[PDB]
Amino acid sequence: KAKRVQAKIEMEFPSEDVAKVVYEAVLYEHLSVPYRRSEIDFKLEGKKIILDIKATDSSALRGTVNSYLRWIKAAIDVI
Amino acid sequence: KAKRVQAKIEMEFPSEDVAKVVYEAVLYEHLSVPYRRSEIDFKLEGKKIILDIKATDSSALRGTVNSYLRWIKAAIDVI
């Protein structure tokens, strides 16, 4: 019985060409997944990586935040 | 190499008094656990709940949601 739900993550990194890097690859596995759950407007601008999300509900979200915070570490791993 | 990582969350609920129950459960659970890592600012204000989370890294950020989102979703099921 949970209604409208929204999440926002920012992250800090060493080089912009290391935020460029982390942001720009997590993107290719985000474009490579149609049928997402449930709403996203990821974006890098500096050395921050910005993640804003939405979920029909409490868990339409949690498993997705998981999904991408690993994917974001999975990206830190090759660096 | 993820320097500081932060997620602000907001949940809107049926009754400004059905959310008051969840706060209280979770808050209890967030507080029947001193030594609680990493950083959590739990504030019920209105029909909305705002879970502020500051962490050491993506991973820190990550698991300090699951157990806490899965607490919220727990409170939800005793109603």
Q: Which residues of chain B neighbour A8 with C-beta distances below 8 Å? A: 7-9
Number of folded domains that form chain A = 1
Question: Which residue in the set A1, A11, A12 is minimally distant from B76, CB to CB?
Answer: A1
Would you say B6 and B58 are in contact if contact means Cβ atoms under 8 Å apart? no
Place of tokens 């049926």: B14
Residue A13: its H or E element: none
User: Nearest chain A Cα to B61, which residue?
Assistant: A69
Q: Three-state SS for B77?
A: coil
Q: Which domain does B67 fall in, by range?
A: 1-79
User: Cα dist. B66→A52, A61, B46 in Å?
Assistant: 17, 10, 24
PDB experimental method: X-ray
Cα(A51)–Cα(B48) distance, integer angstroms: 20
Indicate which CATH number applies to the domain containing B32: 3.30.310.50
CB spacing of B11 vs A3 below 8 angstroms: yes
Q: Please name which of A8, A58, A22, A41 lies closest in space to residue B14, comparing C-alpha atoms.
A: A58
Compute the distance between CA of residue A9 and CA of residue A43 in angstroms, rounded to an integer. 10
- How many whole angstroms separate alpha carbon B55 and alpha carbon A19? 18
How far does A6 lie from chain B, in Å, by closest CA?
A: 6
φ, ψ dihedrals at B72, nearest 5°: -55, -55
Size of interface A-B (CB pairs under 8 A): 86
Of B6, B57, B76, the CB nearest to A10: B6
